[PDB]
A paper describes a structure:
The Neisseriaceae family of Gram-negative bacteria express a bipartite receptor, HpuAB, to efficiently use haem extracted from Hb:Hp complexes as an iron source. [name] is expressed outside the cell, anchored to the outer membrane by its acylated amino terminus. Although a direct interaction between [name] on meningococci and Hb was not detected using flow cytometry, the lipoprotein is required for the high-affinity interaction between HpuB and Hb, for meningococcal survival on Hb as a sole iron source and for efficient dissociation of Hb2023. To investigate the structure and function of [name] we crystallized the carboxy-terminal portion of the protein from N. gonorrhoeae (NgHpuA-C) and a full-length homologue from [name] (KdHpuA).
Crystallization of KdHpuA and Hb at a ratio of one [name] molecule per Hb dimer yielded crystals that diffracted to 2.3 Å. We solved the structure by molecular replacement using KdHpuA and oxygenated human Hb as models and observed a tetramer of Hb bound to two molecules of [name] in the asymmetric unit. Each [name] molecule binds to an Hb dimer and makes contact with both the α and β Hb chains and the two [name]:Hb2 complexes in the asymmetric unit are nearly identical. The aforementioned loops of [name] are major sites of interaction; loop-1 contacts the β-chain of Hb with the hydrophobic side chains of KdHpuA Tyr-60 and Ile-61 packing against Hb-β Trp-15 and Leu-75. Loop-5 interacts with the αHb chain, burying further hydrophobic side chains (Phe-271 and Tyr-272) and forming several hydrogen bonds, including between His-20 and His-50 of Hb-α and backbone carbonyls of KdHpuA, between Hb-α Glu-23 and KdHpuA Ser-273, and Thr-275 and a salt bridge between Hb-α His-112 and KdHpuA Glu-277. Additional interactions involve KdHpuA residues on two other loops with side chains of Ser-94 and Thr-124, making hydrogen bonds with Hb-β Lys-61 side chain and Asn-19 backbone amine, respectively. Overall, 2,540 Å2 and 2,365 Å2 of surface area are buried in the interfaces between the Hb tetramer and KdHpuA chains A and B, respectively. The [name]-binding site on the Hb dimer resides on the opposite side of the molecule to the observed Hp-binding site36, suggesting that Hb:Hp would bind [name] equally well as Hb, and that there would be no direct binding of [name] to Hp. The quaternary structure of the Hb tetramer in our crystals is identical to the R2 state observed previously in Hb crystals grown in low-salt conditions.
Residue numbers in the entry:
A (entry chain C): 1 to 141
B (entry chain D): 1 to 146
C (entry chain A): 15 to 196, 206 to 320
């Protein structure tokens, strides 16, 4: 459960990402695929090499979805229903994979936002990402 | 842990810039702030009620120094982490009963602290290398549960 | 007692001077001295039998000798006990083999809390001769003008940027520094790329002496120069923007060049008022249309 502090911390930090969100998105995916190569199994016919436009494209989708989450931080179950359909109903992603990508997003954010990635903000981003994850991994139709 | 030449030089080149009196206290501090139940293991350290309190707790900083010390030790013995960490594994598992999930969590907060300090030098392959190290350490520290 | 710093032997096959155009260093110095690019191959203290090769910078003093940046020739690191950080206003210089003394801003090691000490593409400080004359300096990787802020859109620099800096003098065989506290108290310089001007004040104290106020300073590409004043004297400002642009690992532009800044202020031949300074970009905005040097907040 996010605190009120947690919500503003997440809005502020993610607000700073601005129109580089697709780049943060793609870098977190690249970090995931390299650090944890079992995660690649979910993308069986992607090009997952260093340059890949496909990873880039996908990263922007992920990053935009998170921006949508941040904008609807109070009612994420309703906001993210279609993505829960995809990840829990269709794809059946093991939740461990969401911890892996969440960790990689945190690392991406630490590397690019060193003023903003304080201990308190790190704490909120982690809680936020865990909450997003829970929603995308739940069947609640 | 097998590191590649490129990986190994990358890890060590970054490790060389780590301020060994501060970075350990940082990582431990973030553990206590991001995963607050870990505070219970350090009830003896006094005020941990606040992120600033935590991060400025001199016993946190002191104790962090020792945990980084152990990771530094680890870097010289990547091929015998279990042996090297045997005494510590007994302390943490048999005596404190730390849930081993928390060893993985600290490994990961340390990785976040590295990236925080080194920014664009903490490239995806450099991270992947550090993941192998922190996973090695956590598993070695958990050995007595296995 | 502080140990004696011995000159680096650049004759070693481990230390090899860097003649690439992209590693070209620029230095502003009251009485000579320059920062100089090397590739340096050294063993790791953490894994034996390794040799690590990295790009680095050394300081060449006026007497011709080269020095590295280490614990003892850099500004006392502020204490970490509280959330708060104070920079001590007075610091010892490190005695050299030559008779001289040295101070510089920072090492390449990690730290927290005080951004103006976390320089990655430049150094500043002072060298004192065996004769007690001082050459103050500031030097580094100049900010390539093709990737200054506004250039992507407008083909020339545009907007404003605001930097947080520390000034340094030498007084009584000690390095003395402008007031710096976490900001709570610091020194801010703002570049206006619309007008080509630089404004701001290096805030003095008991030890540093009087503040240095930027009076009329013009900016052109990645250089600036002009006048400052301090305690009714006029000094000459010379300086530059530093640091290459920052890119995402994709190659896309993340931050423009010139994320660091530095210079000297010269009040007179061997005047003890003479200063170096350096610092880091705290806010920028290419689409700013303001025509003054008021600070970004
Ligand atoms: C913050 C976490 C995540 C977010 C916000 C997210 C978001 C999305 C979005 C927006 C899409 C595309 C839906 C569309 O096309 O409109 C998508 C597709 C996908 N996601 Fe996720 N996702 C996340 C985590 C994961 C993880 C951890 C995995 C697997 C390891 C995963 C696997 C996939 C796959 C396989 C697709 C479909 C790609 C295809 O077309 O083949 N996702 N995700
Ligand atoms: C890889 C992770 C870790 C490493 C390398 C590590 C290392 C160490 C080291 C070197 C000591 C000092 C023991 C001595 O002086 O002989 C220690 C003590 C301790 N560790 Fe850890 N540790 C880790 C993770 C954890 C975690 C996750 C917790 C709790 C959540 C924890 C709780 C403690 C406690 C409570 C002590 C106190 C011992 C005492 O006060 O007598 N450690 N650890």
């Amino acid at each position: 459960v996010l605190s009120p502090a947690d919500k503003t911390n997440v809005k502020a930090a993610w607000g700073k990402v601005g129109a580089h969100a697709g780049e943060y998105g793609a870098e977190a995916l690249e970090r995931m695929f390299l650090s944890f190569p079992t995660t690649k199994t979910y993308f069986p016919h992607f090009d997952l090499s260093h340059g890949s436009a496909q990873v880039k494209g996908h990263g922007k989708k992920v990053a935009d979805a998170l921006t949508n989450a941040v904008a609807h931080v109070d009612d994420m179950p309703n906001a993210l229903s279609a993505l829960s359909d995809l990840h829990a109903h269709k794809l059946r992603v093991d939740p461990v994979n969401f911890k892996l990508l969440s960790h990689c997003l945190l690392v991406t954010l630490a590397a690019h936002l060193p003023a903003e990635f304080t201990p308190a903000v790190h704490a909120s981003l982690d809680k936020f990402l865990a909450s997003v994850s829970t929603v995308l991994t739940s069947k609640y139709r | 842990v097998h590191l590649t030449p490129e990986e190994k030089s990358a890890v060590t080149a970054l490790w060389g810039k780590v301020n060994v009196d501060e970075v350990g206290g940082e990582a431990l501090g973030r553990l206590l702030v991001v995963y607050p139940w870990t505070q219970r293991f350090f009830e003896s350290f006094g005020d941990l009620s606040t992120p600033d309190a935590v991060m400025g707790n001199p016993k946190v900083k002191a104790h962090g120094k020792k945990v980084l010390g152990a990771f530094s030790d680890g870097l010289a013995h990547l091929d015998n982490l279990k042996g090297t960490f045997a005494t510590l594994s007994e302390l943490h598992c048999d005596k404190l009963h730390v849930d081993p999930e928390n060893f993985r969590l600290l490994g990961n907060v340390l990785v976040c602290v590295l990236a925080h300090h080194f920014g664009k030098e903490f490239t995806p392959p450099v991270q992947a290398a550090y993941q192998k190290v922190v996973a090695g350490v956590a598993n070695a520290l958990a050995h007595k549960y296995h | 007692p502080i140990p004696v710093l011995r000159a680096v032997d650049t004759t070693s096959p481990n230390i090899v001077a860097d003649t690439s155009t992209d590693r070209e260093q620029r230095t502003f110095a009251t009485q000579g001295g320059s920062v100089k690019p090397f590739t340096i191959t050294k063993p790791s203290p953490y894994i034996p039998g390794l040799m690590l090769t990295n790009q680095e910078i050394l300081y060449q003093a006026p007497d011709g000798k080269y020095y590295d940046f280490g614990t003892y020739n850099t500004l006392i690191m502020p204490s970490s006990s509280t959330s708060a950080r104070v920079l001590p206003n007075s610091h010892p210089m490190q005695p050299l083999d030559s008779g001289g003394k040295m101070i510089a801003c920072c090492t390449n090691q990690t730290s927290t809390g005080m951004n103006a000490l976390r320089l990655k593409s430049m150094q500043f400080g002072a060298w004192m001769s065996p004769s007690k004359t001082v050459s103050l300096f500031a030097g580094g990787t100049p900010a390539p003008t093709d990737t200054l802020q506004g250039v992507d859109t407008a083909g020339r620099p545009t907007g404003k940027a605001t930097y947080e800096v520390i000034g340094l003098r030498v007084k009584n065989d000690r390095a003395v520094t402008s007031s710096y506290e976490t900001v709570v108290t610091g020194s801010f310089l703002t570049v206006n790329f619309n007008t080509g001007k630089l404004g701001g004040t290096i805030v003095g104290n008991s030890e540093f002496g009087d503040s240095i106020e930027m009076r009329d300073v013009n900016v052109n590409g990645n250089q600036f120069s002009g006048t400052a004043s301090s305690g009714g004297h006029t000094g000459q400002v010379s300086g530059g923007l530093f640091a290459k642009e920052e890119r995402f690992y994709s190659g896309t532009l993340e931050h423009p060049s010139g994320g660091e800044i530095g210079g000297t202020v010269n009040f007179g031949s061997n005047s003890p008022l003479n200063a170096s300074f350096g610092g880091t970009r705290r806010e920028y905005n290419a689409a700013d249309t303001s025509t003054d040097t008021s600070h970004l907040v």
